[PDB]
Design a protein around this ligand. Structure first.
Ligand SMILES: [Ca+2]
Ligand SMILES: [Ca+2]
Ligand SMILES: [Ca+2]
Length: 722
């Protein structure tokens, strides 16, 4: 048997044997001395997979040994054979399965728990492979930061997430926001709701962090003043009695922008609580300026960050989002900049998959853009999730592999492992849907994540290239039709089979991708209709394709803007029939550069605003004027579009003489005529004919220059069609 899909990926793993089958009843060794929470997770796993534990010793059955380095078990070390956990760092484990004996050794209590979750992933229908493993995390504090606007998570969503973190090896969870009666507002009747969260966090080796956001109405001056300050600590002390070992004070929105007053609250709280108890974990906080753009300028730091960094105690943890609030990448250079200001290892608030800024689109991509050496300056990782809790698991899954094993991380593969595991048989169909909903961008200040459906985008671009170059795309068109049908097939089967927990969060988004897919089908119909010269079917398909986009742009759900949605819009703006540049080598009789930058290049530029002008500066070239367009390859053409200078009358072509050629030296003729004097774009139409050089000899032009008739020649755009 082979190694199943693991998460996170262990540091060291090697296939020593083939594999063995697990017996229906086994015997466990080392329950009493081992971690209590680590065995509880293992005991129920055996119950769920129909496995029982023997009361007395049995040589016929398989033996599962578990414990710590602290514990002195002669059975465990013998089953290890040259393998130890003492050489590993905190929260590390060492798993070894060989010849009906599975030994697991952790460094401490936390480490042994993560050894149990690897055993659960290796076992597939009671068939565990034979491999030796030595493993340890790259980041110490890995987890989630619940801080999204809108409707908060429910209690059953939270409890489900706690268990999900432990199995995928994550040890942090921050409460807040949002509008709890106690956190911001008024910071027995609601004791249980918070109590159940802490007890479950202890069972899954996760440090429960309590958040506080008093910024909007906190006071610094006065008695009270001290009274508010005294009334800070007691709020936390109640939770310390409930079992909370981590606390935090947030400044994410404050307005009252005084770093000396914010640090005063943090620093004295660091003395009167976390060091005063001896129980407590280090203090966590978020300054008012958290993004590098708002933090530094430009850069050495702004007025706020200078005072804040130089006041706050080095022991305190500080969170920052990156180059931006919702930014694409976090390069190591940015990490060096922020960490240099604070002179400590910073904590990260990664805003993905959080969709509180762009609620329409879902975020189902991996950890994209983060530098692989981020563990150097950062030893505290947290992500901001979506308000949709079930689907937030896919990105969090990728967060586990990044934070734990950073140097070997691969975002594309870790993404595929997230969907394969969380869905099972229904993974491949979900992959197609999630593939289109990864790139977050509100077309302004927020953008992050992996690009949507790139493979499909390259092919879409490949279609417009081969359409605008005479080339036959029958093979590519056939594949596209199938690709858009695969989208509609996957989205429907998902709708017929998803657990509501998931279905209710993405029901509108499944209907959206289908509407786009159908539009993409209707888009190819137009392209086929243009190649077959079936204008009736073209307009009929155009009727459908336009409606799908209109219903898509009206519908609340948003998905695959760049790829699936934009493909419909491109098929509507495609002429073509143009070819179209650009492409190639426009040349002219005379051009202006000295007086104004308007050379012959701007004649076939594509930009409607830019124009070409004949040489009017002294010594001026007063015609006869002519444009000569070089074609990329020979093309059949039956229409020459002329867009005259819009802003000015100077040099409008009111008389032309178009010629064609295949060598560039010997031109012929195709049409001679005049054009009505105005700013309207003229279409010169003649019979289809192959050509590699398109000439436009000007026989008449006008201008507002007294006796400037025929002295000048200006063209905003000149290009051929066929
Ligand atoms: Ca112990
Ligand atoms: Ca939409
Ligand atoms: Ca132009």
């Amino acid at each position: 048997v082979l190694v199943p899909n693991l998460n996170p990926t262990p540091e060291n793993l090697e296939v020593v044997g083939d594999g063995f089958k697990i017996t229906s009843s086994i015997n466990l060794v080392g329950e009493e001395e081992a971690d209590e929470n680590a065995v509880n997770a293992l005991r129920e796993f055996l119950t769920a997979n129909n496995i029982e534990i023997n009361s007395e010793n049995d040589p016929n059955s398989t033996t599962l040994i578990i414990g710590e380095v602290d514990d002195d078990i002669p059975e465990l070390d013998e089953a290890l054979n040259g393998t130890t956990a003492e050489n590993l760092k905190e929260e590390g484990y060492a798993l070894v399965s060989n010849d009906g004996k599975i030994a697991i050794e952790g460094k401490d209590g936390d480490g042994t728990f993560y050894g149990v979750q690897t055993f659960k992933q290796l076992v597939k229908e009671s068939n565990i492979p034979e491999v030796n493993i030595t493993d340890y995390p790259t980041v110490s504090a890995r987890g989630i930061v619940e801080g999204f606007y809108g409707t908060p998570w429910t209690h059953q969503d939270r409890l489900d997430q706690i268990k999900f973190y432990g199995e995928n090896k994550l040890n942090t969870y921050i409460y807040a926001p949002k509008d709890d009666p106690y956190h911001r507002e008024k910071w027995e009747s609601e004791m249980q709701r918070m109590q159940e969260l802490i007890n479950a966090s202890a069972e899954n080796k996760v440090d429960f962090v309590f958040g506080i956001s008093p910024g909007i109405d906190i006071r610094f001056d006065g008695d009270a003043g001290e009274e508010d300050f005294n009334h800070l600590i007691t709020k936390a002390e109640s939770l310390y009695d409930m079992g909370v070992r981590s606390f935090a004070i947030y400044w994410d929105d404050i307005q009252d922008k005084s770093a000396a007053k914010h640090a005063q609250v943090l620093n004295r709280f660091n003395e009167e609580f976390v060091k005063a108890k001896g129980d407590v974990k280090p203090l966590i906080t978020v300054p008012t300026e958290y993004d590098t753009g708002a933090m530094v300028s430009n850069g050495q730091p702004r007025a706020y960050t200078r005072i804040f960094a130089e006041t706050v105690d080095p022991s305190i943890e500080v969170m920052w989002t990156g180059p931006g609030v919702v930014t694409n990448e976090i390069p190591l250079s940015d990490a060096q900049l922020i960490s240099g200001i604070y002179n400590r290892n910073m904590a990260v608030w990664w805003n993905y998959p959080v969709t509180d800024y762009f609620k329409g689109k879902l975020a189902l991509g991996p950890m994209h853009g983060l530098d692989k050496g981020l563990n150097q300056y950062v030893d505290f990782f947290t992500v901001n999730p979506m308000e949709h809790a079930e689907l937030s698991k896919i990105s969090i899954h990728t967060a586990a592999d990044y934070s734990w094993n950073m140097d070997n991380y691969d975002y594309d593969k870790a993404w595929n492992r997230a969907i394969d595991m969380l869905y099972g048989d229904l993974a491949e169909d979900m992959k197609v849907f999630a593939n289109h909903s990864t790139r977050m961008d509100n077309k302004t200040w927020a953008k992050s994540g992996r690009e949507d459906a790139p493979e499909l985008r390259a092919k879409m671009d490949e279609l417009w290239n081969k359409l605008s170059s005479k080339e036959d795309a029958s093979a590519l068109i056939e594949e596209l039709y199938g690709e858009f049908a695969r989208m509609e097939e996957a989205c429907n089967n998902l709708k017929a089979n998803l657990p509501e927990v998931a279905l209710e969060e993405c029901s509108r988004q499944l209907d959206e991708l289908i509407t786009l897919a159908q539009g993409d089908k209707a888009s190819l119909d137009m392209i086929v209709a243009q190649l077959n010269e079936d204008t009736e079917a073209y307009e009929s398909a155009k009727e459908i394709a336009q409606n799908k986009l209109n219903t898509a742009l009206s519908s609340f759900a948003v998905i695959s803007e760049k790829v699936a949605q934009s493909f419909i819009q491109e098929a509507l703006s495609f002429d073509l029939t143009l070819i179209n540049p650009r492409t190639v080598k426009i040349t002219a009789s005379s051009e202006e550069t000295s007086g104004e930058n308007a050379p012959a290049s701007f004649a076939s530029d594509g930009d409607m605003n830019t124009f070409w002008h004949s040489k009017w500066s002294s010594p001026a070239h007063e015609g006869p004027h002519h444009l000569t367009l070089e074609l990329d390859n020979v093309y059949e053409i039956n229409k020459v579009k002329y867009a005259p200078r819009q802003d000015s009358k100077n040099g409008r072509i009111t008389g032309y003489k178009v010629s064609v050629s295949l060598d560039g030296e010997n031109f012929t003729e195709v049409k001679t005529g005049t054009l009505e004097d105005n700013a309207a774009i003229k279409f010169i139409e003649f019979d289809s004919v192959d050509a590699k050089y398109v000439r436009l000899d000007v026989t008449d032009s006008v201008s507002d220059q007294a006796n400037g008739r025929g002295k000048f020649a200006t063209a905003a755009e000149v290009n051929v069609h066929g």
